[PDB]
Subunit: 427 residues, 4 copies
């Protein structure tokens, strides 16, 4: 026996819940006692999940707004933080298309193994940690906080409340700062911009949001919980059992047993209000990037929860210039921030940056061989004045940090890496 | 019992060795019966490994030369093939830096789990397969062979001859076409352009190459085997046991017991000749991109093995414009090709494309939010004239393909995905 | 391009479906052309999946009946075969409790990652392939077929028809011979002997069986598809949309929106008949091990489908002697076989053997240290007259096979393993 | 930025090394400043590793001796603890044979992916945590510490000092309490009781032990570091550079370049003395279970390091009764303990209990079907008086724990598992 990791008392938890401003608008339908009962006799400390959640929350209140780009590899997250961003978005869509545990390429329908996003959260954290270790030994203060908070996609939870619970717990173990959960049927989950969506009853999503906060409380971390509604476009729901949903039920039924329901901003506003006591940020998927519709939603929701922060998906699934002109595109995010959209993100930023850059390099390489690659290397060199450091790739991935480990173990090692390298001699 | 997967008899195998031109210049120090002894009573078919190896060998003989770019994600390989490339290079350096099974970022020192590259080989093939499947239902003939052969990094084998064997078997199970192996001490392995390299005796690498060939025979696939030598820059060797290495041994020793050895192209040529009978292609790492030095190595080897094909690494570890003028850079691969370097590749192409593109997007996003992303999207729409297809990311990852699966199971499903998607209504 | 892996034409497929007795009683609501449309231009051969499926089919018709024990580790399966069993059962319950990819211990509620069972199938196959490779070099003919067919748990599909499709595809790539699918709501899935079960409509499960068949056809292997119904104990159903389910619907509903239904053998018999055209074997979970009830179910079903084979679960979830006496327990399987249950299995066999055996050893060890282990070693020595071979653990796991590979690569190697070993000198 | 995870100052660390008795006989050839330089700006807390290491250290000084059995699944560890054991042994040999990330069965030669043991360490902790959670809700005080410390096999480090460092880091992240490292060449690694062992220079093993301490220091946890020497039977060494090794080097070399060296207890005493300043425990592999030889090694080492604790492998690789008589077998561990062997373990206990228990079950099942299984089931009911609880497998894997989560989320859920279960109604 030991006292390392001993659980706090229910009294202690109740107290934090009652005094920490963090929980000011947070309703919990279970007790402090209930949380303790599930903690066993040892509570593991989740440093990155704690730090990340705390940082994210402060930024949400200290900045005009927090934006982010989707990252599907650790290096992507490193470049986003090097360029100055202060949060990382981990898209489940990108994980399905190019970074999931089945090894397959999938459309965004919850087809991949449920521990896939948690593994990428752990991966992004490992990469940021390596960047952080490297910055320290290089005396580089170019970046204030390498461990930027990660907001990750919990999709529709991959099942019922217990699958939701295990996903949240695994995201936390991996070091996530925030997670989002949507009101769709897991078995028919869709990207918000794909058709064929099936909502689940308002209450069921409340059970999901409740389960996610519960896993966060049992793991002793203040994870930011985000509720997403897919009701703007969904015309199906699994059941009419919930009276808050009935006003939209048409009565028509499908062969699968689903119910037709009237889609639009109205159902989104209703669900948003019902989810508000259980969500630190609320988000409604929309069919076009429209400041006016965004404002309607914002005023409507804040008219009942003035302090409710909102999230917005600046989706690559929109044909941006088909809808907006440069002036509006230019002010898009600043406008939204004014409305209360404090977390903004380009979900598929990484998928497109990766696919395009490689198509572009490879197309050139197919025509001119080395000339096309040299053009890129020169662009990298030119970007150094902007803060870019990866042209010197050995140090970027830690060659200098491992050299430090090697010489700490054996100062006389004759097998260190950077000394005598072409990096040291040509860059 | 059944007859499915019945092992060939030793005679059938001998016959192929004796009559297939593929084995024309291949020495096997073990016998056909030795192969059969290790096969048990059932031999799995490795369709992709077989097809990729067959296609790779053909292209090496049919094209002026075969070039490639390193890919670390499945989508990367899909873009390389979409852009017209006919082979994919899978760099172990890239896997160490952003795609390995430990989840950590590492310098190129064989620090990651030994099954990492095989997993990426499997991923790459899964992605090319999906592209293949999609092009079929889309009636897209723009690409003749989506399943481009993959040439992957076996580094220094992660141990002894048995570790080499297991890595080759795992690469094959995953569908690899070719694999390369270097003459370095596994426990001190380095990127060819890092310092602190340690060679192993000439005969030890012959054992490695024999092991890689044996695993391919026991698996019954004609995998391409590439032999790499790091003697150009390496100043240390593990032992002076081999008479062929003794000529360069200086007598001086390091505190770890390594032997100092004279590095240069002379040691490279000597090892290249020793490796030939056991190598489909031969590669020597160099400290600079030099057409001259390349010719020297080439003539020297062909002087004794006229038909021996060579491989060359157009490495991002070189500061290209610092050593060459645009005229030479532009003719580089063509020139090398005339010398006999039939397989050429830019090892770290993916690391740079991915890191620079995300840095460029993020920096612009950090300043001007959506304007920066819209610039990228317009670039993608512009690239469609060149054959780029990823702007429509839903179909790119298979939304239409899984829609076809869904409608084959139940043509009247009310939850298919492309109908009513923003991709349909906006692209 | 190459011709390796070219798909069969639609005509060829249609022919096999038309002439092979394997497809005798098999309904496909999709066409042969539909299958070809989903295969892209290359079809990977799945050697063990095909061989296993063919063998299992043959055995189901040539033996009195086929039995099996649940296997959760590769060695478990190897011992099962060594002892004479001719098939392996891969329980999802066991995967949940001690062998899934989350690393966590879980109750049987579909909480683990969807690719867990496929990984265990690949594991079992690799273990069997090693025992086969060893028996060969040892001249051991004690076993005719080391590659016993594996029957694996596909639970409730982990989602919708596309999740079922991917699970089946992954099971096949891993080398499975047959897979079973149940009519429960995946998000609320339960072990068949736990409470809180919820059925899905009859047509929805036909969609699941159709999807499982479609994936096998696309992969081009004769997988055995098994249908399981949970209607004997389930008192809940997601919807009353299907007319075949309505007769059992009571009208009462839960706050979740579920529908109460009347359970018993009646709904199981009706469901069994509906699934019959879509299942190579049918299985109904029961609350106790009752030969009467079993005959009751069998007669009903064969009354309409005479050639329909059934499968029976002799579950550890039953307190066997609390229900039956030794005479009945002794003939249990032989009787069931008469009734037409050609596949019988003890789902949690491995979990109990492993938990009990270790508690027993650890208990004695905590008391008597080495004496307790020696008691076990002597039992293993004793069991050698029965065929047991693991007392000699080094050769059991392949030390001798690998020594052969080492000597094939270098007959003079001074680092082989069995020579000089305590196994060779003390056993 | 946040305060969470801020690194300690070099001064604070130095102070700990200076005053904590834990570090009484520990030599660290690097500085505290060196440790801090490698920690970046945030240090993750490793609760289980910290707790387990502290607990194991206390136990080693509070109990007559600490013993254990090799566990290869989480359920085995659970049983070992339910049965009274206070430590768990994680064998690399068992991982190679039946629990490694490649999915393959291997002999003990460092063939599996290097992150395999860490994942098994994480699995065991997860399982023990599940039991701790269940015990708390069942109010079971039967076990005082479910989180028993785990001592894991680090083998030969899978490479150089950097591979050692990463393996140690990964073992800590997974929650290990102690790790052991042997003086063999990783590429030729062997189970201590197989032939073909190649030693590395005494100084190289000191480097390994130093790297293992550094990784624990950077991770901020007091991990128990164990040194193993294989010099009793090894007759080869990689180099003769170390003057401490030279008295045993014969001058004769093999064709691979290895040096022949005279084996025995003498060079083991020499190596142990050299390793003592860098090892919390020292272990020498022996060819037979000989209390006299044990005493000889023990006395020789303590003559110079009286407080040095020792470890002993009661290997299943020995034919116990062939060497010892019942009386000695009975007092074996008690005697060793008196000599100073405070950690004793049966490396392959899990392998044997698993392989034997299944073969037995399967053999009896192939003959008497249900009768055989029934025999096992009553034995389990019988073992309940001794403290066994797995007969009731649903609660054993957390069915009741997840029911608690379910009702915490929704008290009115109609889909909980234990109510209406055959376990509840028949056990
Ligand atoms: Mg998403
Ligand atoms: Mg490489
Ligand atoms: Mg099951
Ligand atoms: Mg070991």
């Amino acid at each position: 026996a030991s006292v390392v990791g001993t659980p706090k008392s229910a009294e202690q938890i109740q107290q934090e819940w009652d005094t920490n401003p963090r929980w000011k608008d947070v309703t919990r339908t279970y007790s402090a006692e209930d949380v303790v009962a599930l903690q066993g006799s040892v509570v593991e400390e989740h440093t990155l999940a704690r730090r990340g959640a705390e940082v994210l929350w402060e930024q949400l209140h200290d900045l005009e707004w927090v934006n982010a780009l989707g990252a599907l590899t650790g290096n992507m997250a490193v470049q986003q933080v090097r360029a100055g961003l202060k949060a990382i978005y981990l898209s489940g869509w990108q994980v399905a298309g190019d970074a999931n545990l089945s090894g397959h390429t999938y459309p965004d329908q919850s087809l991949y193994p449920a521990n896939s996003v948690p593994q990428v959260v752990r991966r992004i954290n490992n990469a940021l940690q390596r960047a952080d270790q490297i910055a320290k030994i290089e005396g580089d203060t170019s970046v204030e906080n390498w461990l930027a908070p990660i907001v990750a996609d919990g999709e529709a939870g991959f099942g019922g409340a217990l699958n939701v619970y295990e996903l949240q717990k695994a995201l936390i173990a991996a070091g996530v700062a925030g997670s989002h959960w949507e009101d769709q049927l897991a078995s028919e989950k869709k990207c918000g911009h794909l058709g064929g969506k099936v909502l689940i009853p308002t209450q069921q999503h409340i059970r999901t949001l409740t389960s996610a906060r519960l896993a966060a409380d049992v793991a002793d971390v203040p994870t930011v919980v985000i509720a997403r509604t897919d009701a703007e476009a969904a015309t199906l729901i699994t059941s009419d059992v919930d009276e808050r949903d009935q006003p939209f039920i048409t009565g028509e039924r499908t062969r699968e047993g689903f119910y037709r329901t009237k889609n639009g901003i109205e159902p989104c506003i209703a669900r948003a209000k019902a989810y508000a006591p259980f969500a630190d940020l609320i988000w409604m998927e929309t069919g076009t990037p429209d400041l006016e519709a965004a404002r309607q939603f914002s005023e409507a929701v804040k008219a009942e929860y003035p302090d409710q922060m909102l999230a917005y998906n600046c989706s690559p699934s929109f044909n941006w210039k088909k809808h907006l002109d440069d002036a509006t595109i230019a002010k898009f995010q600043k406008e939204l921030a004014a409305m209360g959209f404090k977390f903004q993100f380009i979900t598929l930023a990484g998928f497109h940056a990766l696919n395009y850059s490689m198509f572009d390099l490879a197309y050139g390489y197919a025509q001119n061989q080395m000339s096309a690659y040299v053009e890129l290397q020169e662009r990298e060199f030119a970007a150094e004045e902007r803060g870019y450091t990866a042209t010197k790739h050995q140090r970027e991935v830690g060659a200098g940090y491992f050299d430090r480990i090697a010489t700490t173990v054996d100062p006389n090692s004759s097998t260190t890496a950077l000394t005598g390298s072409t990096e040291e001699g040509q860059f």
